Design a protein around this ligand. Structure first.
Ligand SMILES: Cc1c(CC(CO)CO)[nH]c(=O)[nH]c1=O
Ligand SMILES: Cc1c(CC(CO)CO)[nH]c(=O)[nH]c1=O
Lengths: 310, 305
């Protein structure tokens, strides 16, 4: 069987992900690489009306005290369903075609503009930090994350906050940028922690008060688990209710088999592109399940690109 | 390796599901309704919020768009317990055993009640958008082997009668909702049959606008909704793909119909007699039963009051 290489470009917005991705797609032959872009059209029209604008409006409303936390949460929870739809449905139809891992050329390369966890974990978690979402709803999105498919290569990105703020500026919510930057830092640390043998249940008690595929085992306090210590999730004895505890187990199982890589976005567009290109070399590939999986997968991505990317 | 029997007792609420299961020490565990999660843990009185919002939309106090936001949000809370239970239980499920079992796990509902059925019903009540319904459908966990689902049968007047004397905290006796929820479950049962008999929604799609149920008698009719179609009437691919997931998830489910129009002793035996044709599965580890028990008893203890 032919092999496949799936690469999910994710991380906080405004670092140059899209540009970088397209520069990488432009290098390869017409059909040996395909790009599944940001489904902006689904977010602005198909799934609902201007989903991004509504989110930023709601937070602003909440900040000025024009609405309550409860109102904010209801809107954000509903908007993240809508924000993650396209990633979720894409994962579900792609799944059956994915076979086991081959090893670090590929008959097909799929570059995605983000992964499901972006909408089912990171943004929600970041909204929790902004007070616009409850920790319970975040764990609800976490329990709904699709089984992590083999060969899940995810590229997170590092960019100094001052450069980030600059690049991002053309609203401008700096509190949110800080929160999304923190959430993605926590995330990469969570993957290394879990890959190093870390057991949240065993280290839980170390709670009080970034490298993904390199370095020593991070402290649970530097992982995503610490966000989930909120009083809402704590039983009268101080311990996590089992429902939320089990959601934390799902979060571990989903991230542990992922392959995360860090891309230095503090360089030029072509610099980023080559940088991303070099990184693909150590990324795990998988076999497809049927002979007709490659063509089918291309159609799916092109169709997705045409209907939802612009 | 030992065998396991999973039985999900679902269907529209208010027919007797709770009584049936109740009447029933180590070869069978009953995972009950996670009422405490809906009233306290997940959020504050979630059934109340749901029914209040429908009512206010009905009275003209709020907008369809307002109801939907609350309604979609509330459905995240309602299904959480089911979704989390499926996710930690999934790993331990092996292949089908064949045609007793070491452990019988009786559940009060399946993830599809919160991810498909209630949301579809709210869509039919105007309190949820069809896109939100398909997003929930995109998140339906994969259908493992041995997914036996018991659905209830009961004449509408009996149902209203039985529902009226068994209201839930914050619930309102809404007859329009009762019809909606009853329509969806009937379509649900027809959909599984359709799919198992070879039905292809893409092939039969044209029959909505001009030995298995007609497509118009399946859950696929609900998605003819204008919000999901392009200017030329074609379904957007995002949605079509969501319908492909629905077909895949439903098709492998084993549906069993339990007649509720009888005494609670009748309904208890009824369910038990239904298990002869339910599909069993192997667990994946030797210590999978014990773990499964803890999960189930703990769930019950913490979320079933
Ligand atoms: C994926 C995602 C985003 C990313 C957007 C910028 O908001 C585009 O990168 N933004 C959100 O507000 N929620 C989400 O789920
Ligand atoms: C499962 C479920 C229900 C059923 C309730 C009573 O309405 C408990 O059986 N009700 C909803 O409104 N959403 C749901 O997901």
């Amino acid at each position: 069987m032919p092999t496949l290489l799936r690469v999910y470009i994710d991380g906080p917005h405004g670092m140059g992900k899209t540009t970088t991705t397209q520069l990488l797609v432009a290098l390869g032959s017409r059909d040996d690489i395909v790009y599944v872009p940001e489904p902006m059209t689904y977010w602005r029209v198909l799934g609902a009306s201007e989903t991004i604008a509504n989110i930023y409006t709601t937070q602003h409303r909440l900040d000025q005290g024009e609405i309550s936390a409860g109102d904010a949460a209801v809107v954000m929870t509903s908007a993240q369903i809508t924000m993650g739809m396209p990633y979720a449905v894409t994962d579900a139809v792609l799944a059956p075609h994915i076979g086991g891992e081959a090893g670090s050329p590929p008959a097909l390369t799929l570059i995605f503009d983000r992964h499901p966890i972006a909408a089912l974990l990171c943004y929600p978690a970041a909204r929790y930090l902004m007070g616009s979402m409850t920790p319970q709803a975040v764990l609800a999105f976490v329990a709904l994350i699709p089984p992590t498919l083999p060969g899940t290569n995810i590229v997170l990105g590092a960019l100094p906050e001052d450069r980030h703020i600059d690049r991002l500026a053309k609203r401008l919510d700096l509190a949110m940028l800080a929160a999304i930057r923190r959430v993605y830092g926590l995330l990469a640390n969570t993957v290394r922690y879990l890959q190093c043998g870390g057991s949240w249940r065993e280290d839980w008690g170390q709670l009080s008060g970034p490298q993904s595929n390199a370095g020593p085992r991070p402290h649970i306090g530097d992982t995503l688990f610490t966000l989930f210590r909120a009083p809402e999730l704590l039983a009268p004895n101080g311990d996590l209710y089992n429902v939320f505890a089990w959601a934390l187990d799902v979060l571990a199982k989903r991230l542990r088999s992922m392959h995360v890589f860090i891309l230095d976005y503090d360089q030029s567009p072509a610099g980023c592109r080559d940088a991303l290109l070099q990184l693909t070399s150590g990324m795990v590939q998988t076999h497809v399940t049927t002979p007709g999986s490659i063509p089918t997968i291309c159609d799916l991505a092109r169709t997705f690109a045409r209907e939802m990317g612009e």
